[PDB]
Amino acid sequence: AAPYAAKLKQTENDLKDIEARIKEKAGVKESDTGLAPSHLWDIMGDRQRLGEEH
């Protein structure tokens, strides 16, 4: 059965490689939320968060 048999296992390993590839990919995504005009919002941001006002 050598024409299809050998080539069957070879098919299978590629699919498994592709599944593994997707779990490597999704564990790192695009950085972060940091934006220079809302880094200036941070100055006021520490005080209100720690305070009793919201």
């Binding site: 999704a26 564990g27 790192v28 995504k29 695009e30 950085s31 972060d32």
Partner: protein, 51 residues
């Protein structure tokens, strides 16, 4: 001696707070993961030091 330390050990962890159980819905790149606790809301919470 081993028998007394272990009973104290059983007792110790009961005094420590409870534990829970969720399932990860998605992965975050801030070094966090998004967990959905089974009777409760979603939380993005820091991960264990061993994983």
């Amino acid at each position: 001696n081993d028998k007394v330390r272990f009973i104290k050990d059983e007792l110790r962890l009961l005094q420590e707070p409870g534990s829970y159980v969720g399932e990860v819905i998605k992965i975050v790149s801030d070094k966090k993961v998004l967990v959905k606790v089974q009777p409760e809301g979603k939380y993005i919470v820091d991960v264990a030091k061993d994983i």
